[PDB]
């Protein structure tokens, strides 16, 4: 039968790809980085404590200037903080308080946010009038929005709960491209440094690397057990880290087309909420549901340090574009910026 | 600090004052979840209270304000977003009594009542709603009474005693729905039968909210 033939062909293709991945795995990252100098105990302190949110903080993003920060909470207010002087810059009242993601434009002119309303609202921060107003409302997604990322001042890529992603032109408000192929809900997005490629993790325990221009899925990566919640590109751009409900992080390389390293410990039995690298990529910072964040040696997978200063689970993590400091937001409605010391 | 820095600090203080005022204003509103299946006669309930994505309905009673969220149109895995409603005062569940003999559209043998029971079990026995109360509404009273007059309740409940009467069948349905509460010590179910009188339903909802608030306060005192 045609259906049986197609199923057999799909199974054969799966076997071929797994065999190729096994063959190309001539070695492992652990052996190569065995002799690398351990990073050592990484110690960080909360330099600033941003307060004012009266509900769970669900998302945050760092500006390109590495000084302005944007935070979104279920209270219904989107707050722009001045990290250096812990001074509030803007307080945008959100039409819908059920927001789970937020984004900050690379130029800082626009801020995008969304959630259970299934609409991505874009706010212009540099209008002639001294107030922030909605510039566009991207609607069309059949499910709740999970992540938002600005490609430029006019193009924005958003992932929703309908198991599809979409590239929108802000000026027209029409879906320029639609990305399909995920059999489960999409939970996170991560733009490549080149801005041409991106990778999306889904609840089906898999990540997919797509092409922005061609609107097609270039690669797929598996290895997680239950559900991927966070994803982030390695600074070089040829690799990305994924955090999952399995309480373990996994590093994948696009060129290798398979998992590279796995980060896990017997003391953690809770899922990963957020993931991010340092500027050099040596440190992999992952937020955990156990009221604290962890730092892993991206090369040796050793637990360098713990950032435990939140009374509730760490919901969002971010590293400044320059890597000077790392900000963490938790459900207790407090945002804390951590930095190291000599 | 420079003059511009002082002005920025003053602006931040004004923003903080506005945020505090907005939080104080919002703290006075009761938040209620709304859930159901098969439309659960939900449109009638929402329009009684009032008189894509989440739909928020605000209605003010004699002395209290209520915010109700209809997230039944989300149509996505509840695991990834249900936790957002951890702070809701109560969860209103709506069930159509006529679903006992109706077969789910997505299936061919499972009854809609079984799906409603499964959804009720999932929502009630949830780690995010262990201490949250549930207000259960049974909408299609008249249509259920008409159906049971000809179709026996055993079609959906083989274990049922087989008594073909309205009162006994309704009591059996209520008992079965309440039995799903595996955390009776921490939460309670306020079952009610919907009626054409809107004021009766609104009064019942207000009374349930008041009882929940009183019990929560008493538990704060430690008596519970």
């Amino acid at each position, epitope marked *: 039968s045609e259906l049986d033939q197609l199923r057999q062909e799909a199974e054969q293709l799966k076997n071929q790809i797994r065999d190729a991945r096994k063959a190309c795995a001539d070695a492992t990252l652990s052996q190569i980085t065995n002799n690398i100098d351990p990073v050592g105990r990484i110690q960080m302190r909360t330099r600033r404590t941003l307060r004012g949110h009266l509900a769970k903080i669900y998302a945050m993003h760092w500006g390109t200037d590495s000084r*302005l920060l944007v935070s979104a909470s279920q209270d219904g207010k989107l707050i722009i903080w001045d990290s250096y002087t812990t001074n509030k810059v803007h307080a945008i009242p959100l039409r819908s308080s059920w927001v789970m993601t937020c984004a900050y434009a690379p130029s800082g002119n626009y801020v995008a946010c969304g959630g259970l309303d299934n609409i991505c609202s874009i706010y212009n921060l540099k209008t*002639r009038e*001294g107030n922030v107003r909605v510039s566009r409302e991207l609607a069309g997604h059949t499910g709740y929005l999970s992540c938002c990322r600005f490609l430029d001042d006019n193009q924005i890529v958003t992932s929703s709960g309908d198991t599809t992603c979409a590239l929108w032109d802000i000026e027209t408000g029409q879906q320029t491209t639609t990305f399909t192929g995920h059999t489960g809900d999409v939970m996170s997005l991560s733009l490549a440094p080149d801005t041409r490629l991106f990778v999306s993790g889904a609840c089906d325990a898999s990540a997919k690397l797509w092409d922005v221009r061609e609107g097609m899925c270039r690669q797929t990566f598996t290895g997680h057990e239950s559900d991927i919640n966070a994803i982030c590109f390695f600074p070089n751009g040829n690799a990305f880290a994924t955090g999952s409900d399995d309480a373990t992080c996994r590093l994948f390389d696009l060129r290798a087309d398979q998992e590279l390293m796995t980060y896990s410990h017997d003391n953690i039995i809770c899922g990963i909420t957020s993931v991010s690298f340092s500027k050099s990529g040596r440190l992999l910072l992952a937020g955990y549901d156990d009221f604290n964040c962890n730092v892993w040696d991206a090369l040796k997978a050793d637990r360098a340090g713990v950032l435990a200063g939140h009374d509730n689970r760490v919901s969002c993590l971010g590293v400044t574009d320059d890597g000077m400091a790392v900000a963490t937001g938790s459900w207790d409605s407090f945002l804390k910026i951590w930095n190291g010391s000599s | 600090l420079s*003059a*511009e820095d002082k*002005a920025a600090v*003053e*602006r931040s203080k004004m923003i903080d004052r506005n945020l505090r005022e907005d939080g104080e204003k919002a703290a006075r509103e009761v938040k209620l979840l709304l859930l159901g299946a098969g439309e659960s006669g939900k449109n009638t309930i929402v329009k009684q209270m009032k008189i894509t994505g989440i739909v928020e309905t605000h209605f003010t009673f004699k002395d209290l304000h209520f915010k109700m969220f209809d997230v039944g149109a989300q149509r996505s895995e509840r695991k990834k977003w249900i936790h957002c409603f951890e702070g809701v005062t109560a969860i209103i569940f709506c069930v159509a009594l006529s679903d006992y003999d109706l077969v789910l559209a997505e299936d061919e043998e499972m009854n809609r009542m079984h799906a409603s029971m499964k959804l009720f079990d999932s929502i009630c026995n949830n780690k995010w709603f262990t201490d949250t109360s549930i207000i259960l509404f049974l909408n299609k009273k008249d249509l259920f009474e008409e159906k049971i007059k000809k179709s026996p309740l055993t079609i959906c409940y083989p274990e049922y005693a087989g008594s073909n009467t309205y009162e006994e069948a309704a009591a059996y349905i209520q008992c079965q729905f309440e039995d799903l509460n595996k955390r009776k010590d921490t939460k309670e179910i306020y079952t009610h039968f919907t009626c054409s009188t809107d004021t009766k339903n609104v009064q019942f909802v207000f009374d349930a909210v008041t009882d929940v608030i009183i019990k929560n306060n008493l538990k704060d005192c430690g008596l519970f």
Partner: single-chain antibody
Amino acid sequence: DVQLVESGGGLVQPGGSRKLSCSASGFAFSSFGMHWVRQAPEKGLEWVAYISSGSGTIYYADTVKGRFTISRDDPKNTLFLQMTSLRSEDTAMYYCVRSIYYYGSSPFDFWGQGTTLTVSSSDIVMTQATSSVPVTPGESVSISCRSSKSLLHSNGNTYLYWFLQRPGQSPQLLIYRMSNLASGVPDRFSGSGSGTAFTLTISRLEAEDVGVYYCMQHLEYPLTFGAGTKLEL
């Protein structure tokens, strides 16, 4: 669009009093602090009074302190300056200026038309190189200015503002903080400076660029405007 309309003025007996009223439209008045700037006949700009958003802070010039009082009415989007004991030197054209303060903000971005007022019958000093210089289309010019006290704050921001006044028109902001071009201004202008010596350069002069250029310091009150430089075609 953003607009400020001032009202009140005319002839006043010496020692009299009157309330100047400015109406703001096209923008959130409550979110903007307000300044009053008076220009005497054939003279430079001079700061008068300032009221912050919400009326939380008020400042006056020593020549204005006590005699004139500033207030604002947010719901009607109005600004009031009640002047009493009007001296003969108070005759001038008064402009209302909006200002917004936050990281990356550009205060003094909009200036009102202002109104005329005439009578019957310890701070940073800013100076400019020359009163006037010749100009032709397509040429490059460099106006220079200096301040008694360094404007480079410890935070790293140099509080210098450049304003251009057209003949028969109110001044407009060109550059704020000595390094940020004002929104809508053509890219021809470019400001630079160090500590106490500042210069505004024009890559290629245009026929419209002719006008009176003023320099302002925002490091500390009172705000002092240097003598204007007349750029003549």
